[PDB]
Amino acid sequence: KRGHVLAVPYPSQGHITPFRQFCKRLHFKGLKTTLALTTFVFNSINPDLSGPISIATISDGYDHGGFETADSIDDYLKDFKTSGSKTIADIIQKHQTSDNPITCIVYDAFLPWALDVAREFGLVATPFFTQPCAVNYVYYLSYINNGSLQLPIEELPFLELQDLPSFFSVSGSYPAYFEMVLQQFINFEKADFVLVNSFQELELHENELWSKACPVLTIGPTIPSIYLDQRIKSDTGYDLNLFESKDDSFCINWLDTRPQGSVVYVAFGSMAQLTNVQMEELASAVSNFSFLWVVRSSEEEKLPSGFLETVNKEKSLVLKWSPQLQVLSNKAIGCFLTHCGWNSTMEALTFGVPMVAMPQWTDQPMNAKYIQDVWKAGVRVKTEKESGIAKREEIEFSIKEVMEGERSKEMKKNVKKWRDLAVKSLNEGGSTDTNIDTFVSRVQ
Ligand SMILES: O=c1ccn([C@@H]2O[C@H](COP(=O)(O)OP(=O)(O)O)[C@@H](O)[C@H]2O)c(=O)[nH]1
Numbered sequence: 348k349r350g351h352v353l354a355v356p357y358p359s360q361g362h363i364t365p366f367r368q369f370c371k372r373l374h375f376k377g378l379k380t381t382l383a384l385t386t387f388v389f390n391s392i393n394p395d396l397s398g399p400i401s402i403a404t405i406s407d408g409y410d411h412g413g414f415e416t417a418d419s420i421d422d423y424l425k426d427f428k429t430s431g432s433k434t435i436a437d438i439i440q441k442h443q444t445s446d447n448p449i450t451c452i453v454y455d456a457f458l459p460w461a462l463d464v465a466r467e468f469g470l471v472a473t474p475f476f477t478q479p480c481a482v483n484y485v486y487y488l489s490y491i492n493n494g495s496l497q498l499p500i501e502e503l504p505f506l507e508l509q510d511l512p513s514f515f516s517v518s519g520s521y522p523a524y525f526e527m528v529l530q531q532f533i534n535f536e537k538a539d540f541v542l543v544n545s546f547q548e549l550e551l552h553e554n555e556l557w558s559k560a561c562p563v564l565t566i567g568p569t570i571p572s573i574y575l576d577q578r579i580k581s582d583t584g585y586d587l588n589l590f591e592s593k594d595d596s597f598c599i600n601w602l603d604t605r606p607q608g609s610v611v612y613v614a615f616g617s618m619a620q621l622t623n624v625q626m627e628e629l630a631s632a633v634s635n636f637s638f639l640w641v642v643r644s645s646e647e648e649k650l651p652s653g654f655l656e657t658v659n660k661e662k663s664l665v666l667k668w669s670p671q672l673q674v675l676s677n678k679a680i681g682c683f684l685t686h687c688g689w690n691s692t693m694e695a696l697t698f699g700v701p702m703v704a705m706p707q708w709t710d711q712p713m714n715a716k717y718i719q720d721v722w723k724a725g726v727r728v729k730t731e732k733e734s735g736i737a738k739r740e741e742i743e744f745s746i747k748e749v750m751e752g753e754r755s756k757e758m759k760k761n762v763k764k765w766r767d768l769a770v771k772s773l774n775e776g777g778s779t780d781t782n783i784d785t786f787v788s789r790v791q
């Protein structure tokens with residue numbers, strides 16, 4: 348009972364969620380955990396503090412208004428390094444005289460400066476990569492190559508330019524985040540372990556390639572236990588949400604009244620923004636089906652005028668935010684039109700829902716390539732090259748290709764094999780269970 352982990356996610360939904368889920372595993376194994384949330388995020392969730400994972404607050408330098416009040420991404424990340432370094436040190440010091448001092452920092456691999464704080468206080472230090480091995484390996488190769496990548500890549504020859512992360516195909520875009528994803532490897536060989544939110548059996552070739560450069564421990568998937576191994580009965584869903592849902596039994600009740608495999612689920616995660624024109628083609632494309640579509644509140648203005656009040660409430664429904672895990676488990680869902688964020692992708696792969704891949708940026712084009720051509724669990728929509736948008740009739744074709752045809756009945760079979768491989772990996776003796784045990788043993 349001696350070890351104590353301070354877990355520091357990048358302050359966004361797709362990073363806080365896998366960090367918290369991993370903390371629930373550690374707690375089940377006997378390791379005490381504290382999750383470090385920025386003050387802005389903490390005051391937005393109003394979290395329920397009566398739980399097995401304690402909460403501490405740190406600062407990114409934007410306590411009042413968070414990221415949207417920062418001038419720029421580069422200013423945000425530099426100020427987060429400054430204030431985050433000092434406020435993470437504050438938590439360590441405040442726990443020094445306690446019953447269980449902090450002994451280990453699990454920090455988002457996006458924040459390599461947290462290793463320096465852990466090492467200053469003599470702690471165990473492990474970066475946590477929330478993206479899959481193939482993506483991280485691609486970034487590692489570019490980092491070794493002064494931030495460039497010459498295709499073809501010898502060990503992954505099937506990768507074309509349109510499959511690499513967006514920073515390689517959109518020249519000069521988001522230079523501060525490009526630098527961030529490359530500099531995850533600036534010091535990662537000096538950490539006690541390298542953790543990755545994937546499971547070995549999902550990416551055998553890339554895991555072993557990446558491991559040759561630096562030993563990594565796959566510890567995923569971070570899907571709640573009740574849906575897979577079921578050894579942690581208290582782990583029944585995601586319990587830290589940065590977004591309000593109107594208490595959606597509304598959503599699951601409605602899905603129950605629908606025929607099996609009849610609903611197209613459409614969701615673009617917590618972050619990605621679609622243009623006016625993109626929303627136009629999407630709304631026209633999906634209105635050919637029975638659909639459940641998350642349109643985040645900030646995105647509604649880009650819907651075509653009068654769209655919300657012309658959805659027929661017998662076949663279709665539009666939400667501000669969904670209980671995605673419950674949606675993807677419900678049998679009324681025929682396919683998942685997704686931006687190919689890594690958590691959404693892994694959730695779809697484990698629940699056996701075939702995907703229509705509509706990647707937008709960052710690692711999403713990589714996940715899309717793996718969804719279609721490696722795991723063969725869905726189809727990527729084609730975007731015209733001069734314009735860069737996917738029009739309504741290609742989107743509609745891609746959804747049909749996954750709902751009905753001969754291509755359809757193949758991809759349903761393939762995607763159903765991943766759930767068992769994940770349950771095997773999380774159960775006693777599995778790949779991920781063994782790696783989590785290795786980490787827990789070191790921490791204490
Ligand atoms: O309406 C929604 C949309 C997304 N999610 C959850 O939000 C996370 C999105 O993370 P992902 O890595 O897919 O995308 P990002 O948001 O990081 O771009 C996932 O855990 C989803 O299950 C949800 O609960 N409801």
Ligand SMILES: *[C@@H]1O[C@H](CO)[C@@H](O)[C@H](O[C@@H]2O[C@H](CO)[C@@H](O)[C@H](O)[C@H]2O)[C@H]1O
Nearest residue numbers: 358359360388414415420589617618619
């Ligand atoms: C990274 O930069 C992009 C803009 O290019 C921001 O969207 C992102 O900010 C995130 O925004 C989410 C809401 O859409 C917040 O939930 C999240 O906390 C915040 O980090 C930047 O991270």
Ligand SMILES: *[C@@H]1O[C@H](CO)[C@@H](O)[C@H](O)[C@H]1O
Nearest residue numbers: 521618619620621707708
């Ligand atoms: C950065 O750019 C992409 C568009 O390519 C968008 O999806 C994000 O919302 C934005 O932050």
Ligand SMILES: O=C(O)c1ccccc1Br
Nearest residue numbers: 357359361524528709710
């Ligand atoms: O890749 C991601 O998921 C990501 C998430 C949040 C902020 C920046 C990035 Br580059």
